[PDB]
Amino acid sequence: GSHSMRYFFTSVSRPGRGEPRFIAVGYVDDTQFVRFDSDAASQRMEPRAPWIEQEGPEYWDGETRKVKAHSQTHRVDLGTLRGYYNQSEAGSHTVQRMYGCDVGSDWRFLRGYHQYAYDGKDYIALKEDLRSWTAADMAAQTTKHKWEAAHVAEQLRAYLEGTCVEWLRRYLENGKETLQRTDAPKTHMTHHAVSDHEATLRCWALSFYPAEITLTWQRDGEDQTQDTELVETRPAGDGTFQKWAAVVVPSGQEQRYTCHVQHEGLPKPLTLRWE
Amino acid sequence: NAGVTQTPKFQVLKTGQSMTLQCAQDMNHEYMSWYRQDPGMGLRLIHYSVGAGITDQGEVPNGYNVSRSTTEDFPLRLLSAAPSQTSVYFCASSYSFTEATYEQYFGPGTRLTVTEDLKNVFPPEVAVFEPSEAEISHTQKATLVCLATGFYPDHVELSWWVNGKEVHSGVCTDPQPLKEQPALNDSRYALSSRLRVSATFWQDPRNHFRCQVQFYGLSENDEWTQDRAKPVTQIVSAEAWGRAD
Amino acid sequence: QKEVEQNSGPLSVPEGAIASLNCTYSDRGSQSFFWYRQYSGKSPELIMSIYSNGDKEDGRFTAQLNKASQYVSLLIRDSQPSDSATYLCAVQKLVFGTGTRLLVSPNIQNPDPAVYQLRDSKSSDKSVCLFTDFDSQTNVSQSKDSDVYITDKCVLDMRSMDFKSNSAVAWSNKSDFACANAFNNSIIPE
């Protein structure tokens, strides 16, 4: 088991061309469920998963207001962070905000987080205890001092340890068929020799969720990394995920190299050889 | 730092009249809002800026266009005035939505009456009533009563001026001016106040008392073709002197 | 099922006793709760805000929230008379209840309930009957007769002497109604 809810917000300034671009998206685990786009025709929070469509006017009017505000909050922040850093009104700058909660098998709170980056470096992030702040430069310090004076740490620790978990649970149940599935990796090997001297074995894994996974290569049953490629785990757009990993092998030793798969969907860890 | 300001303070209106209420800001407040409050119910939200150019609808948005570009101003407009809009309008700002600490300051509010026939507006008739000899002996104290009657709308302030200097001690004005005909909708009003002072304050005839009532009626510019006096915004008072009789 | 339902009194405590005011909200999602204090004829004023389960203490004011039962409350420990005024409850600084009218009824050390008739300056047979010096137990009756008008109770504080008095006046269109009207509670010296 185990689950997270996380909200990601992105504000990018486009100088000379009116307000900034705002793009907010809600994930439950590796599943998107809501989005807002400052450009989109509606100017309302839009659903993405099915199960969140069963909420009524109350839910959307509220989630629309909150996320509109998150945008207007960022609109200002850009205004401010130019003063604070002494930067051009001519450059396009980026603010990113990400918060959410984790829960164990038991669905009981494990971890909360709230982080903020200006131009893709950490600015001010909330330490793990949710009582402290990490500020990087004196611009963050000026935030810290003003955020301590509006008891922000306390104010969030309420949402994160409380509300965040209360709705993650609501979602997890109300959307059990979507969110509480574990699709297992469909696995196989390919053998294309790259010369007449050596051979490339590729361990495949397809149509799996969640995206968490680990593929590992073993020469006589020991971890090899020496000639080991391993791709960034990628989506498909059907809501499943894909990953492969390959070793280059002295031809005539294919059977001594074996691939080891691990996933939530998998009752036991899988072992693969050629054939 | 001015706070939040509003204009006007008191306004009569003829049904189907344009009317713009001001709201302001000497603060950096992104979030603003407009409420109506009817004697009985409380604050009901009309519209709200979460920022400049952004406007949303609230609970009771019909009759009322209100939006603003400026973060500083947030005006509110009645295109066609209606009695259904005769209420007290408050305007409120906070530095932040989505955040609790920052306070939500309220304006002084605008008191609005809307009437189908502008003839319905009347100035107050005021009267002071002298304390009872019975009260002065049985209690060793004098209570004066004041009584503004036959006025509309219920827009009135009422202080006591003893010897030409204002007093805020042993004074009591009625929470809400009561309705001369509760059943009829457009009915005239009336309001009473009490001044109490040491027996011997009243007993010396060199002490002077005036009950004063500021009426908020028509303006010089408003049309009027009746026979009776033009019910312009005015002050109406009645006078008493002390007595050793 | 209004967004925000609030205990609709009017509520009355005696001075120095605890006032408890109540609020329930419909919208489950809400996470900020605000208590406002409005004196008659003026404008709301933030007094307290809670955003988290439990008790918030701020001097005489305590605020209580249970996200479970969708309920907010306010203690006014040691009620003073300047507490008399409308208390408004609000979620996310946006939607408000009707309001609860609180009257902290003052501590009248020795009442002398009487009904004295006063007679106006520069006139005659125009006069108003004034029910005064009763104690906060004794409450003020309706009019009954439509042509008769009757004001609410209210409290005078002559700082001069330290003396609090409860008044309440009553007049009619015509003299054909004299001072056997206002429905008495106590003793009635003319």
């Binding site: 998150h70 401010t80 922000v152 509300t163 | 992104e30 | 999602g29």
Partner: peptide
């Protein structure tokens, strides 16, 4: 739900 408090201007 989305955070409705503790989200303040830098």
């Amino acid at each position: 739900e989305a955070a409705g408090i503790g989200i303040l201007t830098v």
